[PDB]
Scaffold this active site. Structure first.
Site, PDB file in Angstrom:
ATOM      1  CD  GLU A  71      -0.766   0.439   3.688  1.00 29.88           C
ATOM      2  OE1 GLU A  71      -1.566   1.370   3.709  1.00 29.88           O
ATOM      3  OE2 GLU A  71      -0.745  -0.359   4.585  1.00 29.88           O
ATOM      4  CG  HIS A 100     -10.228   4.335   7.084  1.00 31.53           C
ATOM      5  ND1 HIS A 100     -11.181   5.292   7.397  1.00 31.53           N
ATOM      6  CD2 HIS A 100      -8.981   4.920   7.158  1.00 31.53           C
ATOM      7  CE1 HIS A 100     -10.484   6.412   7.675  1.00 31.53           C
ATOM      8  NE2 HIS A 100      -9.170   6.231   7.533  1.00 31.53           N
TER       9      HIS A 100
END
Length: 108
Positions: A71, A100
């Site tokens: 990520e 999220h």
């Protein structure tokens, strides 16, 4: 900087790597970043957090033997970190989240 979804998705695939504006959390920490103070801008000006391993424990992202996920923060400029992340796999599959790591959609 390349900190946009399209911007980073395009780059990843062109170069097979993150633009040089990214630094891992452990690197960020070594420069004096304290998550609680929202001070990243101060300690590593022009930088964004990215390149860390996304464990994909919930199985939401397509799994595979020898496929590792990672990520990177999207649209970050200063203060506290936001909720946008790009997720790229070792076989260069790119997904995005804006909630999220709750939902993922294919972008590349």
């Amino acid at each position: 900087v390349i900190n946009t979804f399209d911007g980073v998705a395009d780059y990843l695939q062109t170069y097979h790597k993150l633009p040089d504006n990214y630094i891992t959390k452990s690197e960020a920490q070594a420069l004096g970043w304290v998550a609680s103070k929202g001070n990243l801008a101060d300690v590593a000006p022009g930088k964004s957090i990215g390149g860390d391993i996304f464990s994909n424990r919930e199985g939401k992202l397509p799994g595979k033997s020898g496929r590792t996920w990672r990520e990177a923060d999207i649209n970050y400029t200063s203060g506290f970190r936001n909720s946008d992340r790009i997720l790229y796999s070792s076989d260069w599959l790119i997904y995005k989240t804006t909630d999220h790591y709750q939902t993922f959609t294919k972008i590349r």
